[PDB]
Chains A and B, each alone.
Chain A
Amino acid sequence: EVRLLESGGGLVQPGGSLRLSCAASGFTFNDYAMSWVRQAPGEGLEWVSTISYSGGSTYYADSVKGRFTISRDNSKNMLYLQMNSLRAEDTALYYCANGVATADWYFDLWGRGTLVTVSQSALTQPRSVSGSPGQSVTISCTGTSSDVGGYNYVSWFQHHPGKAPKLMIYDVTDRPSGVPDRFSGSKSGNTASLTISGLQAEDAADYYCCSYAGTYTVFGGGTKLTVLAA
């Protein structure tokens, strides 16, 4: 059905150049914004760039601004990322994402990711939280007045490094398809909060809050959730 497929990753020398590709399938590609999100080994999720549905709007992260160029070919159902002046800190698994099922500014559809090898200001989360199976945990996310306190476009993601993140909560409180009611969200001022009840062993993962602020998307630092067996 609906699919995103990244490609074009490989080993490149520092300062080199690479072009990434994302293949859409199963939906009207030119009706939706496309975004690139990366994860560097040992690092949390980082929003890289977003292109609007038409192509006349490109948004970039300051950590990459000037060196990458995002583009899309709506005739070919393809999204592209032109990465130049590639540094070591750009070594990451790269993902393309859109909001085909929720809204144009969210990430609910993800690809499998492509691996790029080159030879913070994030929202504040707890680094670690633990809980016993069946119990409940609450994870907090504190941002500025320009993101979490600016709009109500907050998201929560489940993630295991080496696979794409999964959208668990969008619009502060709502669950996409397939997410149990054990996950619920809330917001107060500049702080958002995810609560996971009825903890199971498979709930152990990394949890990131996310905020869309118009000109940019920003992820939290991430909270490792350990479910201690019993």
Chain B
Amino acid sequence: CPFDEVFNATRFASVYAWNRKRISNCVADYSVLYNFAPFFAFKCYGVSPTKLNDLCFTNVYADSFVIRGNEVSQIAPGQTGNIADYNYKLPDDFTGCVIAWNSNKLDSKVGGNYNYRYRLFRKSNLKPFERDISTEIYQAGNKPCNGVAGVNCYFPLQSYGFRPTYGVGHQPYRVVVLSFELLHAPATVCG
């Protein structure tokens, strides 16, 4: 299985435009991740990972993005905050695992890494597994803003500015979210 294509990738996606890769037509052995980074968190929800070698799943989705360390707790079923509500939402029925590790050596830059952004304003919360890459102005006031930012109308995206001088809470963390799906279609990912 193309686990390396997701984990050892050069650049990860911003959390607001998060990446999804469908895993199929392969055997899912995780020895790779076991021989991967010293992990910050390996949080599985609704599934024993000690049973992830006898899996027999049809489709497995590898969601990947970058956030700060403070926000890794938000990547969980039934959480709240800017990331969980505006950028990446997991369902309360989530059947998968969240793998995260400090990426400060790859994603932090000298004057801040302003290529990683996240969504700060949204009128309603995302539905689970929804993706909003819109860049349109936000209306915090009652002035109708005809595509123009300003006094009470905001641009909805904000860069992280990852710097090596930040503490681990604000340092970049790469997150891979494996969603284990069970449909009637025969097994395409096994162990």
Contact = CB atoms under 8 A, between A and B. Distances in A.
Interface of A: 33, 50, 52-54, 56-57, 59, 102-105, 151, 153, 171, 212, 214
- Interface SS majority for chain A: loop
Contacts of A33: 109-111
Contacts of A153: 164
A33 B110 CA distance: 7
B110 to A, nearest CB: 4
B114 A214 contact: no
B109 A212 contact: no
Interface residues of B, number: 11
Contacts, number: 37
Contacts of A57: 110-112
A54 B164 contact: no
Nearest to B162: A104
A104 B165 contact: no
A104 B114 contact: no
A105 B111 contact: no
Nearest to B114: A54
B108 A104 contact: yes
Interface string B163-191: 11100000000000000000000000000
A190 to B, nearest CB: 18
Contact of A214 (B105, B106, B164): B164
Nearest to A215: B165
Contacts of A52: 109-112
A59 B106 CA distance: 21
